[PDB]
Amino acid sequence: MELRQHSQIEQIENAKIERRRREHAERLKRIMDEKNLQMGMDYDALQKQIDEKKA
């Protein structure tokens, strides 16, 4: 209710705008590498699961 909201809200939306531009850019890089797009896998962190099941 009580706030300066618009002066705070502008900063909130500016952070959101910058947030989306980062994840847009890094998504673009990993997309253009068509091995990761069609076929790739997270082979390192996937292995950590297997030793857990052994334990």
């Binding site: 989306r20 998504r27 069609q38 076929m39 896998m41 996937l46």
Partner: protein, 430 residues
């Protein structure tokens, strides 16, 4: 912003719910205390300082299940008002859970759900969980839904319920409760998803590699489906699908709303490392009878409109290539009046894995909900079991003594019979 409310009825509803809220808090990045070490608004509220609170209400008529949450790790997350526990359960009796004991607590619950909806500025739907065989799941669920229908009117009431299995059963009075609750849900529920334990039990053994599962393994599977369905409201994507879009595209008529569930890939970590799981692969796995979460084969029936949800680094081209290939498959039928037959969505946020979890951390996944006439197979099985018991009046005295009038037993039988007639006429073509 845009809000969804979850209500958890009965032992099954509570047990599913605490697994689900573990998935969401770990997904967004919230500690069990509610603190932090975005889309929080869709499921949570900000209390002040830095603490969050879920939009959920837990209801049961006996305290054992709810008190586990009260002494569990997540006791600090929930508002004490959200956890509602009765004094003595309905004893798998629909009449006891509807008339005698259900009305002792109904108005206490309706205040708390209504009060929570005040905090939801942009409310767009509810999520409600059941187990049909239980007294509270069927009896109190009907009373909750009937009241909620007139209280709020045109708001999407989505349900996620557990069908009795075709052969696996834990209650003898199980057929009695399911049919009586069938009448109440058909007119009031906007759309209700179907799953059964026996199909889930077979899936977590073959696809996931577990010799001997428990209810925890099955319930974590259900949470993935709810996570994928609601991801369109929470995270960015190339093709958004709101609750209303789901409701319009899936159901051709008001009475035919029941979908069935599917999810892919469901694979163990070592076999996930063995294969590569492209978009065409996961779409193919959805349509096999083995992956269906309800133990009814679609090949006995035909398909109406199906809805696809894709999560990960999936590109709109690879989706169109995959779905067209499925149309070429002559092991899949479509009724003639649905040539389009599909609704697709693409979202960028991969699924979330859990410590001690069962599924692999794959980077592209798909979720499926389809409307099929094969569900009439499940209706016929429940009908036959009910007739054998009711012909000789095997358990009537318990329900009548708890306020139920006997005339409701044939009425619920006829309403189910009318529902079976609708599917057969829809299944025909001209």
């Amino acid at each position: 912003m845009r809000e969804v409310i979850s209500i958890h009825v009965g032992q099954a509803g509570v047990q599913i719910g605490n697994g689900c809220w573990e998935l969401y808090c770990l997904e967004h990045g919230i500690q069990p205390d509610g603190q932090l070490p975005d889309a929080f608004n869709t499921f949570f509220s900000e209390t002040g300082a830095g603490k969050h609170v879920p939009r959920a209400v837990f209801v049961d008529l006996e305290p054992t299940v709810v008190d586990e949450v009260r002494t569990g790790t997540y006791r600090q997350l929930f508002h004490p008002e959200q956890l509602i526990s009765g004094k003595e359960d309905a004893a798998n009796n629909y009449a006891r859970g509807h008339y005698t004991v259900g009305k002792e607590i109904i108005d206490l619950t309706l205040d708390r759900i209504r009060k929570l909806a005040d905090q939801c500025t942009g409310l767009q739907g509810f999520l409600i969980f059941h187990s049909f065989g239980g007294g509270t799941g069927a009896g109190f669920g009907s009373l909750l839904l009937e009241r909620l229908s007139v209280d709020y009117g045109k708001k999407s009431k989505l349900e996620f319920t557990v069908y009795p299995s075709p052969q696996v059963s834990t209650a003898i009075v199980e057929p009695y409760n399911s049919i009586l609750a069938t009448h109440s849900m058909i007119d009031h529920s906007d759309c209700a998803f179907m799953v059964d334990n026996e199909a889930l039990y077979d899936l977590c053994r073959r696809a996931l590699d577990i010799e001997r599962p428990t209810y925890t393994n099955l319930n974590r599977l259900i949470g993935q489906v709810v996570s994928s369905l609601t991801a369109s409201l929470r995270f960015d994507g190339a093709l958004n699908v709101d609750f209303t879009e789901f409701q319009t595209n899936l159901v051709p008529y008001a009475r035919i709303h029941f979908p069935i569930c599917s999810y892919a890939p469901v694979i163990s970590a070592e076999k996930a490392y063995h294969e590569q799981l492209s978009v065409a692969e996961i779409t193919n796995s959805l349509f096999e009878p083995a992956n269906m979460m309800v133990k009814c084969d679609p090949r006995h029936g035909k398909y109406m409109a199906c809805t696809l949800l894709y999560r990960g680094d999936v590109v709109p081209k690879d989706v169109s290539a995959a779905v067209a290939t499925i149309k070429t498959k002559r092991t899949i039928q479509f009724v003639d009046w649905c040539p389009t037959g599909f609704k697709m969505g693409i979202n960028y946020q991969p699924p979330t894995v859990v410590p001690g979890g069962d599924l692999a951390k794959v980077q592209r996944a798909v979720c499926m909900l389809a409307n099929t006439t094969a569900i009439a197979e499940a209706w016929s099985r429940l009908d036959h079991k009910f007739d054998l018991m009711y012909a000789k009046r095997a358990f009537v005295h318990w329900y009548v003594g708890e306020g139920m009038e006997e005339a409701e037993f044939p009425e619920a039988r006829e309403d189910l019979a009318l529902l079976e007639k609708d599917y057969d006429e829809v299944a025909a073509e001209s």
